[PDB]
Design a protein around this nucleic acid. Structure first.
Ligand SMILES: [Mg+2]
Ligand SMILES: [Mg+2]
Ligand SMILES: [Mg+2]
Ligand SMILES: [Mg+2]
Ligand SMILES: [Mg+2]
Ligand SMILES: [Mg+2]
Ligand SMILES: [Mg+2]
Ligand SMILES: [Mg+2]
Ligand SMILES: [Mg+2]
Ligand SMILES: [Mg+2]
Ligand SMILES: [Mg+2]
Ligand SMILES: [Mg+2]
Ligand SMILES: [Mg+2]
Ligand SMILES: [Mg+2]
Ligand SMILES: [Mg+2]
Ligand SMILES: [Mg+2]
Ligand SMILES: [Mg+2]
Ligand SMILES: [Mg+2]
Ligand SMILES: [Mg+2]
Ligand SMILES: [Mg+2]
Ligand SMILES: [Mg+2]
Ligand SMILES: [Mg+2]
Ligand SMILES: [Mg+2]
Ligand SMILES: [Mg+2]
Ligand SMILES: [Mg+2]
Ligand SMILES: [Mg+2]
Ligand SMILES: [Mg+2]
Ligand SMILES: [Mg+2]
Ligand SMILES: [Mg+2]
Ligand SMILES: [Mg+2]
Ligand SMILES: [Mg+2]
Ligand SMILES: [Mg+2]
Ligand SMILES: [Mg+2]
Ligand SMILES: [Mg+2]
Ligand SMILES: [Mg+2]
Ligand SMILES: [Mg+2]
Ligand SMILES: [Mg+2]
Ligand SMILES: [Mg+2]
Ligand SMILES: [Mg+2]
Ligand SMILES: [Mg+2]
Ligand SMILES: [Mg+2]
Ligand SMILES: [Mg+2]
Ligand SMILES: [Mg+2]
Ligand SMILES: [Mg+2]
Ligand SMILES: [Mg+2]
Ligand SMILES: [Mg+2]
Ligand SMILES: [Mg+2]
Ligand SMILES: [Mg+2]
Ligand SMILES: [Mg+2]
Ligand SMILES: [Mg+2]
Ligand SMILES: [Mg+2]
Ligand SMILES: [Mg+2]
Ligand SMILES: [Mg+2]
Ligand SMILES: [Mg+2]
Ligand SMILES: [Mg+2]
Ligand SMILES: [Mg+2]
Ligand SMILES: [Mg+2]
Ligand SMILES: [Mg+2]
Ligand SMILES: [Mg+2]
Ligand SMILES: [Mg+2]
Ligand SMILES: [Mg+2]
Ligand SMILES: [Mg+2]
Ligand SMILES: [Mg+2]
Ligand SMILES: [Mg+2]
Ligand SMILES: [Mg+2]
Ligand SMILES: [Mg+2]
Ligand SMILES: [Mg+2]
Ligand SMILES: [Mg+2]
Ligand SMILES: [Mg+2]
Ligand SMILES: [Mg+2]
Ligand SMILES: [Mg+2]
Ligand SMILES: [Mg+2]
Ligand SMILES: [Mg+2]
Ligand SMILES: [Mg+2]
Ligand SMILES: [Mg+2]
Ligand SMILES: [Mg+2]
Ligand SMILES: [Mg+2]
Ligand SMILES: [Mg+2]
Ligand SMILES: [Mg+2]
Ligand SMILES: [Mg+2]
Ligand SMILES: [Mg+2]
Ligand SMILES: [Mg+2]
Ligand SMILES: [Mg+2]
Ligand SMILES: [Mg+2]
Ligand SMILES: [Mg+2]
Ligand SMILES: [Mg+2]
Ligand SMILES: [Mg+2]
Ligand SMILES: [Mg+2]
Ligand SMILES: [Mg+2]
Ligand SMILES: [Mg+2]
Ligand SMILES: [Mg+2]
Ligand SMILES: [Mg+2]
Ligand SMILES: [Mg+2]
Ligand SMILES: [Mg+2]
Ligand SMILES: [Mg+2]
Ligand SMILES: [Mg+2]
Ligand SMILES: [Mg+2]
Ligand SMILES: [Mg+2]
Ligand SMILES: [Mg+2]
Ligand SMILES: [Mg+2]
Ligand SMILES: [Mg+2]
Ligand SMILES: [Mg+2]
Ligand SMILES: [Mg+2]
Ligand SMILES: [Mg+2]
Ligand SMILES: [Mg+2]
Ligand SMILES: [Mg+2]
Ligand SMILES: [Mg+2]
Ligand SMILES: [Mg+2]
Lengths: 96, 51, 76, 63
RNA sequence: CAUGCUUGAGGUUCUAACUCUGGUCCGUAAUCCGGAUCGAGGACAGUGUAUGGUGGGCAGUUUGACUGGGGCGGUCUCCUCCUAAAGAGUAACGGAGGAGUACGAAGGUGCGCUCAGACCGGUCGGAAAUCGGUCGCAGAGUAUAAAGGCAAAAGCGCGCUUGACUGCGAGACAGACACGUCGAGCAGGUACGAAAGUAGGUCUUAGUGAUCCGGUGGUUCUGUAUGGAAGGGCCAUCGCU
RNA sequence: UCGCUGUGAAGAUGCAGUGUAUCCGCGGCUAGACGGAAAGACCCCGUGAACCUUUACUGUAGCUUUGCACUGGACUUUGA
RNA sequence: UUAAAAACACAGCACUCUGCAAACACGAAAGUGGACGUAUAGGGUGUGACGCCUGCCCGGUGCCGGAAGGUUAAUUGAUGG
RNA sequence: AACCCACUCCCGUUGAAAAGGUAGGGGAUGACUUGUGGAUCGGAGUGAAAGGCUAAUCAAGCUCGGAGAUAGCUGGUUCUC
RNA sequence: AAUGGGUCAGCGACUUAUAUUCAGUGGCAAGCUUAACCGUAUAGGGUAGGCGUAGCGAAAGCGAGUCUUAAUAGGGCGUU
């Protein structure tokens, strides 16, 4: 970072923003990884039975990336509008 | 020397403009119509204190 | 000595010469005052900058009374 | 041992999939004598210059 | 006003805390030290802790660079001209000058109009006031240096007025970076004008200072068990010869 | 391991041209080998060091002021 | 261990501090010196036998005395938000 | 005279000697010289005061540790195409 | 006529640890890889963790989009 004596970049520009502590317990799951849980139920615990999310995650959201293999049931997991369509398109329900 | 002033909107918003003036020469306040971004109308702004 | 002062250079002059192809928004001349005047398809900035408002070719013609120098955009 | 990131460099530059973000200078005070156009175009976030990336990445311990 | 129970300071006194580098007894065979007892002082002195003053007695340090060697003197940022070799740029303790502002109209628009000077004629003025005529055309003017401009005057006067607007922004010029400069067009709301239209300050180029930190006004953000709040973020703005 | 006049990192035994001159000691003298000795002490530089000064800065020992504690009784003046 | 002097000391002179558990100095302190002394004494400072003398200035900076008034610390906590 | 000192010249300077010698010089009953034993020391002591002396070392001794302090400065950096 | 070397022989200066980035060369591959630790001990187990499969925003959040904005307008970043 030294520049010969001139004011360096890491002291010439302003600091900005704050770090979210609410997003540390968060994870996103692709629709391609839904057909990797044990059987026919995608829950917060079942995702940790596979190795899809860490052990300290409470909130999970499913986004559209890829395509859903089989029909699965999501339990207490949020989904985007596009992801919810493909999940229900492939014979999967979305309860609780 | 010219001193800074604020121009506060007559509407209920907290929007304000900023300029300066010569207090010694013209001692009255300024009443000038300006566009208020919050209400999206031209309203009257009144001089206030910069500090 | 009591003289050692000067100011930074301003990089003025012609930026596009006759026959060159231009786009709208291109700066044509940097000026103090108007050595050149705005012809057809050319605008004037508040510091007398000539800029293009259409696509075409620079012309650089002298015309009219007063013997003025004009910059205009013509078809390519 | 582990490489230590510069604390003040990580408060001014943010990593994205497009590069490194930062805010603009000359926007803290003395704002009355400034044009609105000049203050409007110093408002958002820009990416790091091509010649500046190597120095900043070394400070952040990204290389 | 009287008394009552409290309560800040002042003075005097008493003895019982404390002090004695005062006497005589014992430990003891001892000018130390204890205990006893007389004498003196006395809630003072003195010590702990908190706080103001003084304090080179002592301590850790600072005290710029350029520079026809250093020192002394001068300079250090910005604008204009020459050097600068007819694109841009270009050095010297080279030659010459300015800036660290001004203006709520000195800004916008519609309408209208041309100067300086010379001569002749004309009450006190008389070369130079105001008036009439002819010539003159820019030798005037332009807030502020100099250069480049100025008839659709960019110069001058009058009526209305706030575009010295908010969000942007195709595309460029400059450029190590950080900064800088110009701008058609779109969307909101305006102002002048019958209207086409013009207006995102001023004829242009100087009139300036990063980040950190702190203050003020807003806010679909956050807010350490939970609901709040404090604090933080974002937007606007203030504080550096 | 010669002289001179030029040249040349600018004062040459060693380069150019030229002149002199068999090979090797001993006793003497100090003109040169920018002779030996001591990483110049003068001068400048280093975001070097020590020590000294003071109305440089920031502190501090000592000295001193007051609140609280050790620390009590009575009388009187007096404000609340 | 390149300077023996006009440098230091000196007898004499003056100012100032100190009442004794003295001022002062060495000691985190106990204590010790001063002193088994007591203002004709003790410490510090300057000048430097002797003779004749030592003039003017108290504005600055020190030191000494004053206490009316102004400013002023910890502490306390009326009032407001 | 002894004894203590160190004013001048010369010699010596790889010395007889890391401060001497020959020839002259000063004090020599005193603020004298000297033996033995003891006390005070490193921001400390002692100093008739030269910044002198504290084991041939002094504008802050020596020794061992922090310690391979730091050195934008000198020097050096090893086989072949 | 600037520095260093009297000569010989021996010795004498780009290393190691841990975190990383790029290149070459390999193993697996929408997955890859384990650390401490057990261990029949260079095997095998251990997938806690790390990186990748999605980005934008200061964030809440929304997501092949998202931020700015009154604005499915423009623009920044991202997506085959
Ligand atoms: Mg600087
Ligand atoms: Mg896992
Ligand atoms: Mg120039
Ligand atoms: Mg314009
Ligand atoms: Mg950090
Ligand atoms: Mg930092
Ligand atoms: Mg920093
Ligand atoms: Mg920081
Ligand atoms: Mg600013
Ligand atoms: Mg701000
Ligand atoms: Mg005593
Ligand atoms: Mg007391
Ligand atoms: Mg007391
Ligand atoms: Mg005390
Ligand atoms: Mg001192
Ligand atoms: Mg000192
Ligand atoms: Mg000092
Ligand atoms: Mg230091
Ligand atoms: Mg220093
Ligand atoms: Mg300094
Ligand atoms: Mg200098
Ligand atoms: Mg000079
Ligand atoms: Mg020179
Ligand atoms: Mg010279
Ligand atoms: Mg020169
Ligand atoms: Mg010279
Ligand atoms: Mg040129
Ligand atoms: Mg040229
Ligand atoms: Mg130039
Ligand atoms: Mg040059
Ligand atoms: Mg004008
Ligand atoms: Mg002119
Ligand atoms: Mg007008
Ligand atoms: Mg306006
Ligand atoms: Mg426009
Ligand atoms: Mg409009
Ligand atoms: Mg109209
Ligand atoms: Mg700071
Ligand atoms: Mg809470
Ligand atoms: Mg808040
Ligand atoms: Mg702001
Ligand atoms: Mg010769
Ligand atoms: Mg010669
Ligand atoms: Mg010769
Ligand atoms: Mg040769
Ligand atoms: Mg020769
Ligand atoms: Mg040759
Ligand atoms: Mg011989
Ligand atoms: Mg001889
Ligand atoms: Mg000789
Ligand atoms: Mg010589
Ligand atoms: Mg020599
Ligand atoms: Mg050396
Ligand atoms: Mg040297
Ligand atoms: Mg310096
Ligand atoms: Mg330097
Ligand atoms: Mg000193
Ligand atoms: Mg001081
Ligand atoms: Mg003190
Ligand atoms: Mg006390
Ligand atoms: Mg001597
Ligand atoms: Mg003598
Ligand atoms: Mg002598
Ligand atoms: Mg002496
Ligand atoms: Mg004494
Ligand atoms: Mg006396
Ligand atoms: Mg004395
Ligand atoms: Mg004297
Ligand atoms: Mg004397
Ligand atoms: Mg004397
Ligand atoms: Mg005398
Ligand atoms: Mg006085
Ligand atoms: Mg007086
Ligand atoms: Mg007094
Ligand atoms: Mg002697
Ligand atoms: Mg003799
Ligand atoms: Mg003798
Ligand atoms: Mg004697
Ligand atoms: Mg005697
Ligand atoms: Mg005697
Ligand atoms: Mg004697
Ligand atoms: Mg004796
Ligand atoms: Mg002894
Ligand atoms: Mg001892
Ligand atoms: Mg020492
Ligand atoms: Mg000492
Ligand atoms: Mg002395
Ligand atoms: Mg001494
Ligand atoms: Mg001296
Ligand atoms: Mg020794
Ligand atoms: Mg010695
Ligand atoms: Mg020292
Ligand atoms: Mg260390
Ligand atoms: Mg070393
Ligand atoms: Mg060095
Ligand atoms: Mg250097
Ligand atoms: Mg060298
Ligand atoms: Mg060396
Ligand atoms: Mg030679
Ligand atoms: Mg030499
Ligand atoms: Mg040589
Ligand atoms: Mg050299
Ligand atoms: Mg040599
Ligand atoms: Mg070896
Ligand atoms: Mg690779
Ligand atoms: Mg591979
Ligand atoms: Mg977009
Ligand atoms: Mg894109």
């Amino acid at each position: 970072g030294f520049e010969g004596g001139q004011q360096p970049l890491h002291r010439r520009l302003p600091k900005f923003g704050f770090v979210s502590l609410k997003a540390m317990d968060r994870a996103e799951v692709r629709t391609s990884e839904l057909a990797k849980v044990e059987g026919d139920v995608v829950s917060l615990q079942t995702l940790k039975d596979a190795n899809l999310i860490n052990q300290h995650v409470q909130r999970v959201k499913v986004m559209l990336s890829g395509e859903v293999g089989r029909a699965v049931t999501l339990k207490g997991i949020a989904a985007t509008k596009g992801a919810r369509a493909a999940i229900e398109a492939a014979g999967g329900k979305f309860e609780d | 020397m010219r001193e800074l002033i604020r121009l506060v909107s007559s509407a209920g918003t907290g929007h304000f403009y900023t300029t300066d003036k010569n207090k010694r020469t013209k001692p009255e306040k300024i009443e000038i119509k300006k566009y208020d971004p919050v209400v999206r109308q031209h309203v009257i702004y009144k001089e206030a204190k910069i500090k | 000595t009591r003289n050692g002062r000067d100011s930074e250079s301003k990089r003025l002059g012609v930026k596009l010469f006759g026959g060159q192809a231009v786009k709208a928004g291109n700066i044509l001349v940097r000026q103090r005052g108007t050595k050149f005047h705005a012809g057809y398809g050319v605008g004037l900035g508040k510091d007398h900058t000539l800029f293009a408002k259409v696509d075409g070719v620079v012309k650089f013609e002298t015309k009219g009374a007063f013997g003025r120098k004009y910059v205009s955009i013509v078809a390519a | 041992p582990k490489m230590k990131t510069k604390s003040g460099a990580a408060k001014r530059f943010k990593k994205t999939a497009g590069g490194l973000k930062h805010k603009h200078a000359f926007k803290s005070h003395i704002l009355t004598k400034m044009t609105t156009k000049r203050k409007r175009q110093l408002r958002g976030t820009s990416m790091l210059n091509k010649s500046d990336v190597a120095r900043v990445e070394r400070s952040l311990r990204l290389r």
